Design a protein around this ligand. Structure first.
Ligand SMILES: NC(=O)c1ccc[n+]([C@@H]2O[C@H](COP(=O)([O-])OP(=O)(O)OC[C@H]3O[C@@H](n4cnc5c(N)ncnc54)[C@H](OP(=O)(O)O)[C@@H]3O)[C@@H](O)[C@H]2O)c1
Ligand SMILES: Cc1ccc2[nH]c(C(=O)N3CC=CCC3)cc2c1
Length: 298
C-alpha cells in the first residue's frame, strides 16, 4: 500500500508519527514503535529534533533481528534540523542520526524547516530570542542531493515549505533531484488544497502531519476547536461505524495525500491501521472539504 515517488522509490501511505513531548520517558518510544510495527505500520517518521532516534532505531532493529520485518520493508524518515542548514554540516548531521539509530541508511531525509538557525537546538540571544542564520536553501538542497548520491538517504524531501519555497528548489539551475515530498500540517481545518494541487502538478507527494488535529501541547492555543469532536467527522464516524480519527486519516488517503498518525496508545495504534478497511463516498469527501477554515495548530 504505497505511492511511487518521483525518484522511483516507494513510500507506504500510512505512517507512524514518533514525536512525544519531553514529559514522556524516552523508553516509551521503543515500546510504542515495536507495537506500531506489530500492528502493520511500515513507514516510521522521526527527526534529530525529537531526541528519540536511538529508541526508534532500536525498535526497528529489534523487529528486523527477530524476523518480524525486513529492513527493505521499513520506510524510516529522519530530518535535518535547522542549525545544520550550512552545506558542510548536512552530511555529518545525517551521519549522526544514522549513528544514533544504528541504521545504515534512511529511506527519506528531509529539510525539517525552511528556517536557518545559528550552527552549534534553539540558540537564543541575550534577550530570548532565537538566533537565525542566512543560508540559501538551494545550497542546503545541493548538500541533500549528495546524501542521496552517497546512498545515505534513499529519497530526499522537504518539510514546512510553501509553494514559493518549493519553487526556489524546483527552479534551481543544475537541479539534480526534485524533492519527493513536502511534509506539512494538513487536516480538515487546514486542508492545503491549493498546496496539494501544486505538489501533484510537480509530482511531489504531500505528507500530512497533525492529521488527527495535533497533540494540543500547551506550549497550540487551548481555545482552538478540537478536530476529532467536529460534528461532521463524528457523523461520518457513525455512518461508517469507525471513529473520527479514522475518518480523518481516510480523507487524506482518498485525496492522494500520505498521512502520518501519532499514537502512544496500544489500542489506538492498532485501530489506525483500519484505515485500509473502508471508504468514504464522494459526498463524504465533500462534507470533509467543507470544514477547511485555515486553522493552524502548530
Ligand atoms: N515535519 C514537522 O514539522 C512535523 C510537525 C509536527 C508533527 N510531525 C510528525 O507528525 C507526527 C504526527 O503529528 P502530531 O504529533 O501532531 O499528532 P497527530 O498524528 O495529529 O496525533 C494527535 C493525537 O491523536 C491521538 N490519536 C491517535 N489516534 C487516535 C484515535 N484512533 N482516536 C483518538 N485519538 C487518537 C494521539 O494521542 P495518543 O498518543 O494518546 O493516542 C495523538 O496525540 C508527529 O508524531 C511527527 O512524527 C512533523
Ligand atoms: C520552528 C519549527 C519548525 C518546524 C517544526 N516542527 C516541529 C515538530 O516536528 N514537532 C513539534 C510539534 C509537534 C510534533 C513535532 C517543531 C518545529 C519548529
Amino acid at each position: 500500500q504505497c505511492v511511487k515517488l518521483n525518484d522511483g522509490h516507494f513510500m507506504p501511505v500510512l505512517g507512524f508519527g514518533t514525536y512525544a513531548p519531553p514529559e514522556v520517558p524516552r523508553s516509551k518510544a521503543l515500546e510504542v514503535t515495536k507495537l506500531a510495527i506489530e500492528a502493520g505500520f511500515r513507514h516510521i517518521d522521526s527527526a534529530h529534533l525529537y531526541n528519540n532516534e536511538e529508541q526508534v532505531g532500536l525498535a526497528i532493529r529489534s523487529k528486523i533481528a527477530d524476523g518480524s520485518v525486513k529492513r527493505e520493508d521499513i520506510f524510516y524518515t529522519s530530518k535535518l534540523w535547522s542549525t545544520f542548514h550550512r552545506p558542510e554540516l548536512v552530511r555529518p548531521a545525517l551521519e549522526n542520526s544514522l549513528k544514533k539509530a544504528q541504521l545504515d541508511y534512511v529511506d527519506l531525509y528531509l529539510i525539517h524547516s525552511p528556517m536557518s538557525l545559528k550552527p552549534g537546538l534553539s540558540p537564543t540571544d541575550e534577550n530570548g530570542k532565537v538566533i537565525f542564520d542566512i543560508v540559501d536553501l538551494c545550497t542546503t538542497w545541493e548538500a541533500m542531493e549528495k546524501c542521496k548520491d552517497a546512498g545515505l538517504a534513499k529519497s530526499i524531501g522537504v518539510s514546512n515549505f510553501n509553494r514559493r519555497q518549493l519553487e526556489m528548489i524546483l527552479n534551481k539551475p543544475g537541479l539534480k533531484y526534485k524533492p519527493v515530498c513536502n511534509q506539512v500540517e494538513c487536516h480538515p481545518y487546514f486542508n492545503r488544497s491549493k498546496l496539494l494541487d501544486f505538489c501533484k502538478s510537480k509530482d511531489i507527494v504531500l505528507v500530512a502531519y497533525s492529521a488527527l488535529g495535533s497533540q494540543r501541547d500547551k506550549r497550540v492555543d487551548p481555545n482552538s476547536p478540537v478536530l476529532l469532536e467536529d460534528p461532521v467527522l463524528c457523523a461520518l464516524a457513525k455512518k461508517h461505524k469507525r471513529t473520527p480519527a479514522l475518518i480523518a486519516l481516510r480523507y487524506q488517503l482518498q485525496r492522494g495525500v500520505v498521512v502520518l498518525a501519532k499514537s502512544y496508545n496500544e489500542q489506538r495504534i492498532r485501530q489506525n491501521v483500519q484505515v485500509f478497511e473502508f471508504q468514504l463516498t464522494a459526498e463524504d469527501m465533500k462534507a470533509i472539504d467543507g470544514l477547511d477554515r485555515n486553522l493552524h495548530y502548530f
